[PDB]
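Model the whole thing, not chain by chain.
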Amino acid sequence: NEDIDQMFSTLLGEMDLLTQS
Amino acid sequence: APGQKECDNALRQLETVRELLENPVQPINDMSYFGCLDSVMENSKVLGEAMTGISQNAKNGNLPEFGDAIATASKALCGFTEAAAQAAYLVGVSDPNSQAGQQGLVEPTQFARANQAIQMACQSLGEPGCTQAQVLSAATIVAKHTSALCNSCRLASARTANPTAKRQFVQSAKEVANSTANLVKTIKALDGDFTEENRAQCRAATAPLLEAVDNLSAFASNPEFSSVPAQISPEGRAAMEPIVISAKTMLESAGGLIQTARALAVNPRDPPRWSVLAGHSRTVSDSIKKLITSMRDKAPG
């Protein structure tokens, strides 16, 4: 569901940063 | 009438922002002293332009443009007051007999609000009578606050020189993010097929998130991560007073300015009120001049 994915875009960005550690 | 809502809103915001000047003995933002001076200079300039917009547009009956000028003035007055209150604090804490505190790793009020909001949204996803639309609205609340928690965790990790705390803030954030991601799977399933079984599966997936929120709250509440209040000496309080008095005087005149302008917008044929408006406007400018002079004199560094 692309609409629900969009709703969580800010969290996805956070996850992208957290994954770097 | 255009301008009327703006004046009422501006007067309300002024009443709220003046509270910052009551006992400015703790930091209210992250601005340096020169950061405050920069903000005072920028906001003074904007306010100057806005006061001319207020008078000229009221005079000529350009009501939408009047409302815009009122709104711009209000924003500038608030920015100005935030800078003044922070500057006052920095002057106070700079006194030799004042005791500087320390910034906590995570701002406690929004942290608590984020946790509470996630908990209640999770409870909503659990209500038997929850409409399908309410699943999606609950999801938006989860999305907002879980991402905010993770952001706060990364900030806290950056702020601490304790290597163990650095790592744990990141790990706790990962737990919040990953538990949320699992919940998102079930939200998608429930939205796609609104069955009692999928409702139960969604309810179930809230548990690991609630646990992640609780675990982070427990970890982040360590007294070693907490803020320590500043202690301002009587000498520090005396030193910051000229900044505070000038900021208070500015807001008093600005309130009078907006009240006078509100009346003139409605009826600009009023020579006495034009004089009153010019008096308030000049007193705003005088107060700003006095505040800037005081800031230059009382500068810590």
